[PDB]
Structure 1
């Protein structure tokens, strides 16, 4: 279970980083409009 929980933290951190990248991209578009 400890390894599974560690893996899930790592998974969510990567999902979150993807979303942060999307938010940056969209904020750039917002600025341009």
Structure 2
């Protein structure tokens, strides 16, 4: 019964790693948008 608990756990850990990788991708794209807004504002001013 608990053996199943270990597998569901390896599963939760796997989904957690996928979430962390997705968050890392989001942060990189968000940083590009921050840079892009900075460039456009400098052009406008």
TM-score of the aligned structures, taking structure 2 as reference length: 0.70
Structure whose alpha-carbon radius of gyration is higher: 2
**Residue-pair matches, total:** 33
Cα RMSD, aligned residues only: 0.5
Q: How does 1:1-12 map to 2 (within 5 A)?
A: 1-12=1-12
**Residue 21 (structure 1) aligns with:** 21
Kindly report structure 1 stretches of 4+ aligned residues shifted beyond 4 Å. Answer: none
Q: Where does the alignment leave 5 or more consecutive residues of structure 1 unmatched?
A: none
5+ residue gaps in structure 2? 34-45
